[PDB]
């Protein structure tokens, strides 16, 4: 029978691109997010979601690109916690309730981001979330073995994550990046998708965080 | 003009030992926690606390030793969020409202723990919290400069943190650790206190995480 | 028109498997090592090797699986230095003289190994070599941009690397690993080759070290 | 029965400052370098040296500040290997022959430097050396237990290490760093020496790398 994928966050950006690349005659690709009725921050919603999916092979979580920007002294802690509730706690909830459905040879692939390790002013919420994701990924890899668990850590990537910026501001952001990254380009969703596919396919990889950040971490 | 310290969590274990060591004729040492009326997880309570203290030199946070032990698939997420609310968000709140009172030459020293980087089954809450603390320590060091910000990362230390274990259990934990660690002993509070004093004293250290873990990280 | 690859160490184990996977109607794959007349430890030999190849697209270095095992206090430093001359200095020399031949879109992929970061008694030579490779990889990524530079860090993989072992001891080594790694198998060369293909393919990745170690780093 | 220190590299800069601070009525401090007849890169010289000293308590190695600056593609590999021979292999040799003379409760403290982990163009030799030192430090901590083994990782410090610079360019270097660093100053030898004293003093620390870099790693 077909290999079955669940992509929480697969309705937009990196997750949607991955889901697109995963579709074939030999696969079933489920995507879900708030717009499909799933709130990954909500434990009951996640629990009942997997109940309806049943046994599957690979879980990928890309949900939750929002975080309040700003200095620690200025950021509203309520908004920071909200951000944590989706990206961090949502991944925890997805693993907690999804793992029991994973078939032999399956895996979980979470998402962090280079701010876990690139120290940048005004980014503590993103950095803390990503650091937590990477640590939890490794604990999960140990606890769920032989189910494999890894994380992809993207650098700046052109997606809907930035649909709320003024378009000119967005372009200037992309251009600054292009101009200062060693690779001399901004990431495309398909560049990041490739890394999830690699984690999914490699039966000798678990507890790993794969950076795809155009050299951003090199400072 | 005495040097003024604030130790949030200074009423027990590691904080208490440090507070004791900071006491002198040329210092004033404030300690606080729930038993003195400070709930570090409550923003208005933290704000009130620093209003009562006024200008001071060094802030140290050791508060929040609790975390629900167990596998990701077994741990109660409400309890996990509770732990985060004290140790992680408490540290965030303490920096956020304490920073403006720090005098020239001042510092903030937070507390993580070797589980940020030592991967151990059944410890995701502690590991995630400590990873978040370490990432946030570094962002703070960048944002609050020239105020210095560092973190102490302890290994197993004999304190009231374990007061709620089956006494048979705790002794077994202590003996097994003493048996397996390169240094052949469990940590004493004074060993860890020494590290805060070092962070406080060193005008050339910021953004650093100091491990005092008896070699546990070496596996 | 065709994409040209150079694999130094491509005559055995991981390098040979990679070279086999790179072969196609669209590519030209060159492999080299001592048995083909290239000693990667010898600067003149390396310099003259690249003259004979001319312009190419991707350099991969897997050469040098040997290192004297044993405690720091016991290991013959002369033999330790010999191991460095091939695997570490070899990589340096290949980058130093090969870089100027790399076409637009090109990349260098080096090889380290999990012992860079998994602390194991009796392995200081392998650990130090791998640590040096990973650091040099990142410096190279910055210096050679937009040429991309990454490293693959393998865990235990069944190859000719262990041809010097008694066959029974080797089977037992493999089995102890299979029995204890989270993924419950020993690495095959094709599992590691997959990672080099990924690094070659991803135009948004540079300065990255990719672990494919079956979970060994999780301890 | 006084406590005996050996500081290889103790005739200049950081090592000399530490030697000065170690002097006491209850200590004996030995310093040594080429100018005293110890060439730490030469195994028989190192062996001879420890025969002359006999049983002692704490070994500190600061020897070998030199390295050829420049890009991988430009640096003379002979000079690069010379740098490794002193700072890296010298530390290896010192531990190898010094370890057997270490009294109960003793320790080894080595020196790396922030470039192990801060990626900077034109620094591969220093970066690789320091990465190798940090990895070897941890292996030694495991192998020599209960002897404790740690390393200090300095950032820019005002010492004789920069004597060979055009006194104009050296001032440019100091001033530029003072203005870029979070702590707003260049390191003084005493700042770094403090960290060795802390490693020597702490019976619960081993396998640890202590950064004292004024925030350089924060980027
Ligand atoms: N693009 C970049 O520059 C970077 C990307 N990333 C990380 O990669 C991941 C994906 O990023 P990206 O594809 O660009 O983001 P997008 O904004 O394009 O997509 C975000 C997705 O998350 C879903 N989502 C948000 N909240 C919830 C929720 N409460 N429950 C269920 N689904 C939710 C969204 O759908 P819906 O609104 O319907 O819920 C959407 O499908 C994120 O973790 C992001 O932080 C990391 C670093 C850099
Ligand atoms: N001991 C060990 O083996 C390890 C220690 N640590 C870490 O070191 C730090 C201190 O540990 P330790 O000294 O052993 O802990 P203790 O359990 O001895 O002390 C904890 C302190 O935190 C205070 N506290 C708890 N909750 C709050 C709150 N909501 N608001 C204000 N204060 C609070 C407590 O006082 P009160 O109840 O009155 O609020 C108490 O003063 C912790 O971060 C811990 O995780 C890290 C790794 C290993
Ligand atoms: N297999 C494993 O378990 C592990 C593998 N690795 C690393 O991966 C890399 C490759 O491993 P593996 O494929 O298994 O090793 P193999 O021993 O199968 O192959 C090693 C290759 O290096 C070549 N070589 C050795 N010395 C020189 C030299 N002086 N000049 C040119 N070529 C040389 C060999 O060919 P020739 O004899 O003709 O020179 C051979 O092609 C190594 O860096 C190794 O340390 C890392 C960790 C785990
Ligand atoms: N100052 C800085 O900005 C930084 C310092 N450091 C590191 O700290 C350590 C010390 O630095 P620093 O004190 O400034 O350097 P110094 O140049 O002041 O001192 C170097 C010492 O090493 C000795 N030495 C050199 N070669 C040998 C040898 N072959 N055998 C025995 N001894 C030798 C020298 O004496 P002699 O000539 O008699 O041999 C001298 O005592 C080094 O590892 C350095 O890399 C790390 C990062 C930044």
Pocket test for ligand 4, best of D16, D19, D64, D116 (most atoms within 8 A of CB): D64
Residues 61-120, chain C, touching D (beta carbon < 8 A): 71-73, 75, 77, 80-81, 84, 88-89, 92-93, 95-96, 99-100, 116-117, 119-120
Distance in angstroms (rounded) separating the CA atoms of residues B178 and B187: 9
3-state SS, one letter per residue, for B18-39: HHHHHCCCCEEEEEECHHHCCC
Distance in angstroms (rounded) separating the CA atoms of residues A204 and B5: 51
A92 closest CA partner among D146, B26, C89, B73: B73
Instruction: Using DSSP, state whether B207 is helix, strand or coil.
Output: coil
What DSSP state is assigned to residue C5?
A: E
Closest in C89, C95, C135 to D127, CB measured = C135
Ligand whose nearest atom lies closest to the CA of A174: 1
Instruction: Using DSSP, state whether B157 is helix, strand or coil.
Output: strand
Cα diameter, chain D: 53
Question: Which CA distances in Å does A132 have to A46, A108, B44, B182, D64?
Answer: 20, 16, 26, 28, 39
Residues contacting residue A169 through CB under 8 Å, at least 6 positions apart:
none
Instruction: Using DSSP, state whether B60 is helix, strand or coil.
Output: strand
3-state SS, one letter per residue, for chain D: CCEEEEEECCCCHHHHHHHHHHCCCCEEEEEECHHHCCCCCCHHHHHHHHHHHCCEEEEEECCCCCCCCCCCCCCCHHHHHHHHHHHHHHHHHHHHHHHHHEEEEEEEEEECCHHHCCCCCCCHHHHHHHHHHHHHHHHHHHHHCCCEEEEEEECCECCHHHCCCCHHHHHHHHHHHHHHCCCCCCECHHHHHHHHHHHHHCCCCCCCEEEECCCHHHC
Distance in angstroms (rounded) separating the CA atoms of residues D51 and D97: 9
Residues contacting residue C163 through CB under 8 Å, at least 6 positions apart:
none
Question: Which CA distances in Å does B107 have to B111, B148, B154, D180?
Answer: 13, 5, 19, 19
- Smallest CA–CA distance, residue B181 to chain C, in Å, is 14
B60 closest CA partner among B117, B17, B116: B17
What DSSP state is assigned to residue C36?
A: G
A206 closest CA partner among A154, A132, A129, A145: A145
Residues contacting residue D180 through CB under 8 Å, at least 6 positions apart:
none
Q: Which residues pair with residue D2 across a beta bridge?
A: none
- Residue whose entry in the numeric block shows the structure tokens 């390169």: B182
Angle, alpha carbons A206-A207-A212 (nearest 5°)? 95
Record the tokens describing residue C53, joined without a space. Answer: 């190849």
Q: How far away, in angstroms, is A14 Cα from ligand 1 center?
A: 8
B59 CB-contact burial (10 Å; exposed 0-12 / middle 13-18 / buried 19+): buried
Distance in angstroms (rounded) separating the CA atoms of residues A83 and A90: 10
B36 closest CA partner among B23, B21, B19: B19
- Residue B157 φ/ψ, nearest 5 degrees: -130, 135
Q: How far is CA B145 from the centre of its chain?
A: 21
C129 closest CA partner among B100, A14, D95, D139: D139
Helix axes B77-98, A77-98, angle to 10 degrees: 160
Query: Is the Cβ–Cβ distance between A116 and A138 less than 8 Å?
Result: no
Distance in angstroms (rounded) separating the CA atoms of residues D116 and C132: 9
With residue A210 as reference, give the H or E element that holds it. Answer: strand A209-212
Count the residues in chain B.
219
Ligand whose nearest atom lies closest to the CA of C177: 3
How many CB atoms within 10 Å of residue D61? 26
Distance in angstroms (rounded) separating the CA atoms of residues A120 and A213: 15
Query: Got the DSSP string for B104-136?
Result: EEEEEEEE--GGGTS--TTBHHHHHHHHHHHHH
- What number of C-beta contacts closer than 8 Å exist between C and D? 116
A40 is in an annotated binding site: yes
- Residue D73 φ/ψ, nearest 5 degrees: -70, -15
Closest in A119, A217, A218 to D218, CB measured = A119
B181 closest CA partner among D58, D101, C70, D207: D207
Query: Is the Cβ–Cβ distance between B92 and A83 less than 8 Å?
Result: no
Record the tokens describing residue C74, joined without a space. Answer: 């016991």
Question: Which CA distances in Å does D170 have to D158, D173, D175, D217?
Answer: 10, 5, 9, 21
Chains that touch B (3 or more CB pairs under 8 A): A, C, D
Distance in angstroms (rounded) separating the CA atoms of residues C134 and D117: 10
Q: Cβ of A195 and C194 within 8 Å? A: no
Query: Is the Cβ–Cβ distance between C141 and D72 less than 8 Å?
Result: no
Distance in angstroms (rounded) separating the CA atoms of residues B196 and B151: 8
Instruction: Using DSSP, state whether C210 is helix, strand or coil.
Output: strand
What DSSP state is assigned to residue B58?
A: E
Q: Residue A217: its chain D contacts at CB < 8 A?
A: 119
Query: Is the Cβ–Cβ distance between C148 and C108 less than 8 Å?
Result: yes
Name the closest residue on chain C to residue A135, using Cα atoms: C218
Distance in angstroms (rounded) separating the CA atoms of residues A28 and A57: 10
Q: Which residues pair with residue D58 across a beta bridge?
A: D5, D107
> Which amino acid residue places its CA nearest to atom 16 of ligand 3?
C161
Record the tokens describing residue C57, joined without a space. Answer: 């697209």
Distance in angstroms (rounded) separating the CA atoms of residues B85 and B92: 10
Q: Cβ of B118 and C219 within 8 Å? A: yes
| Strand duo B56-61 + B3-8: pairing | parallel
Record the tokens describing residue C78, joined without a space. Answer: 């002369």
With residue C31 as reference, give the H or E element that holds it. Answer: strand C27-32
A66 closest CA partner among A36, A47, A40: A40
D62 closest CA partner among D166, D195, D171, D177: D195
Query: Is the Cβ–Cβ distance between C172 and C206 less than 8 Å?
Result: no
- Check whether the bond before C44 is cis (ω within 30° of 0): no
Sign, CA torsion A47/A50/A55/A59: negative
- Check whether the bond before D146 is cis (ω within 30° of 0): yes
- Residue whose entry in the numeric block shows the structure tokens 């966050």: A9
Name the closest residue on chain D to residue C128, using Cα atoms: D132
Distance in angstroms (rounded) separating the CA atoms of residues D49 and A101: 65
> In b/e form, how buried is each residue of B15-35, taking b as 16+ CB within 10 angstroms?
bbbbbeebeeeeeebbbbbee
B50 closest CA partner among B61, B65, B35, B62: B61
| Strand duo B27-32 + B3-8: pairing | parallel
Angle, alpha carbons B169-B173-B179 (nearest 5°)? 140
- Smallest CA–CA distance, residue C26 to chain D, in Å, is 30
How many CB atoms within 10 Å of residue C56? 18
Contacts 24+ apart (CB under 8 A), D88-91: D88/C128, D88/D64, D88/D129, D88/D132, D88/D133, D88/D136, D89/C77, D89/C81, D89/D41, D90/D8, D90/D40, D90/D41, D90/D46, D90/D61, D90/D63, D90/D64, D91/D40, D91/D61, D91/D63, D91/D133, D91/D136
Angle, alpha carbons C9-C13-C14 (nearest 5°)? 75
Rg over alpha carbons for chain B, rounded to the nearest Å, is 17
Cα diameter, chain A: 54
Distance in angstroms (rounded) separating the CA atoms of residues D130 and D136: 10
Angle, alpha carbons C178-A133-A2 (nearest 5°)? 60
Distance in angstroms (rounded) separating the CA atoms of residues A195 and A154: 9
Residues 171-210, chain D, touching C (beta carbon < 8 A): 207
Query: Is the Cβ–Cβ distance between A54 and A43 less than 8 Å?
Result: no
- First vs last Cα of chain C: how many Å apart? 46
C16 closest CA partner among C62, C72, C70: C62
Question: Which CA distances in Å does B175 have to B156, B169, B181, B215, C121?
Answer: 11, 10, 10, 15, 23
A6 closest CA partner among A94, A89, A65: A94
> Which amino acid residue places its CA nearest to atom 25 of ligand 2?
B64
Q: Cβ of D118 and A219 within 8 Å? A: yes
- Residue whose entry in the numeric block shows the structure tokens 């981001």: A113
Query: Got the DSSP string for A161-176?
Result: GGTTS-HHHHHHHHHH
With residue B98 as reference, give the H or E element that holds it. Answer: helix B77-98
With residue B138 as reference, give the H or E element that holds it. Answer: helix B124-144
Count the residues in chain D.
219
3-state SS, one letter per residue, for A78-143: HHHHHHHHHHHHHHHHHHHHHHHHEEEEEEEEEECCHHHCCCCCCEHHHHHHHHHHHHHHHHHHHH
Sign, CA torsion A14/A19/A22/A23: negative
Q: How was this structure determined?
A: X-ray
- Residue whose entry in the numeric block shows the structure tokens 């702590």: D183
Closest in D141, D187, D194 to B215, CB measured = D141
Query: Is the Cβ–Cβ distance between C192 and C212 less than 8 Å?
Result: yes
Query: Is the Cβ–Cβ distance between B134 and B153 less than 8 Å?
Result: yes
- Residue B76 φ/ψ, nearest 5 degrees: -75, 120
A49 CB-contact burial (10 Å; exposed 0-12 / middle 13-18 / buried 19+): buried
Q: How far is CA D216 from the centre of its chain?
A: 18
Distance in angstroms (rounded) separating the CA atoms of residues A103 and A82: 32
Question: Which CA distances in Å does A41 have to A44, A84, B68, D88?
Answer: 9, 9, 20, 50
Distance in angstroms (rounded) separating the CA atoms of residues B195 and B210: 7
- Residue C218 φ/ψ, nearest 5 degrees: -75, -15
Instruction: Using DSSP, state whether C9 is helix, strand or coil.
Output: coil
Alpha-helical segments (H) within chain C: 13-22, 43-53, 77-98, 124-144, 167-180, 189-201
CATH no., domain C1-219: 3.40.50.720
Distance in angstroms (rounded) separating the CA atoms of residues A212 and A153: 6
- Residue C138 φ/ψ, nearest 5 degrees: -70, -40
Question: Which CA distances in Å does D129 have to C62, C121, D82, D153?
Answer: 21, 20, 11, 12
Query: Is the Cβ–Cβ distance between D49 and D38 less than 8 Å?
Result: yes
Distance in angstroms (rounded) separating the CA atoms of residues B95 and D156: 28
Distance in angstroms (rounded) separating the CA atoms of residues A189 and A49: 26
Distance in angstroms (rounded) separating the CA atoms of residues D10 and D18: 7
Record the tokens describing residue D143, joined without a space. Answer: 């192998």
Query: Is the Cβ–Cβ distance between A181 and A214 less than 8 Å?
Result: yes
Distance in angstroms (rounded) separating the CA atoms of residues D42 and C159: 36
Q: Which residues pair with residue B149 across a beta bridge?
A: B108
Closest in D148, D201, D212 to B183, CB measured = D148
- Residue whose entry in the numeric block shows the structure tokens 């009725």: A37
Angle, alpha carbons A174-A175-A178 (nearest 5°)? 90
Q: Which atom of ligand 1 is nearest to the CA of A34?
A: 39
Cα diameter, chain C: 54
Query: Is the Cβ–Cβ distance between B55 and B28 less than 8 Å?
Result: no
Distance in angstroms (rounded) separating the CA atoms of residues D130 and D209: 11
Distance in angstroms (rounded) separating the CA atoms of residues D9 and D81: 19
Query: Is the Cβ–Cβ distance between B141 and D215 less than 8 Å?
Result: yes
Distance in angstroms (rounded) separating the CA atoms of residues B73 and B83: 17
Distance in angstroms (rounded) separating the CA atoms of residues B145 and D214: 10
C44 closest CA partner among C52, B42, C199: C52
């Amino acid at each position: 029978d077909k290999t079955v994928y669940v992509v929480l966050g697969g309705t937009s950006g990196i997750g949607a691109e991955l889901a697109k690349q995963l579709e074939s005659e030999h696969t079933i690709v489920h995507v879900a997010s708030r717009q499909t009725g799933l709130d990954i921050s909500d434990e009951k919603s996640v629990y009942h979601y997997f109940e309806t999916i049943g046994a599957f092979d690979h879980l990928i979580v890309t949900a939750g690109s929002y975080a309040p920007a700003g200095k620690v002294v200025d950021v509203e802690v309520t908004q920071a916690k909200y951000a944590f509730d989706t990206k961090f706690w949502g991944a925890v909830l997805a693993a907690k309730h999804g793992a029991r459905y994973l078939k032999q040879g399956g895996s979980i692939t979470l998402t962090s981001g280079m701010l876990s390790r690139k120290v940048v002013a005004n980014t503590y919420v993103k950095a803390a979330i990503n650091a937590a994701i990477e640590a939890t990924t490794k604990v999960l890899a140990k606890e769920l073995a032989p189910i494999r668990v890894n994380a992809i850590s993207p650098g700046l990537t052109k997606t809907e994550a930035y649909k709320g910026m003024n378009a000119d501001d967005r372009d200037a952001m992309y251009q600054r990046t292009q101009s200062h990254l060693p690779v001399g380009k901004v990431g495309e969703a398909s560049d990041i998708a490739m890394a999830y596919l690699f984690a999914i396919q490699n039966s000798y990889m678990t507890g790993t965080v794969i950076d795809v950040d155009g050299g951003a971490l090199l400072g």
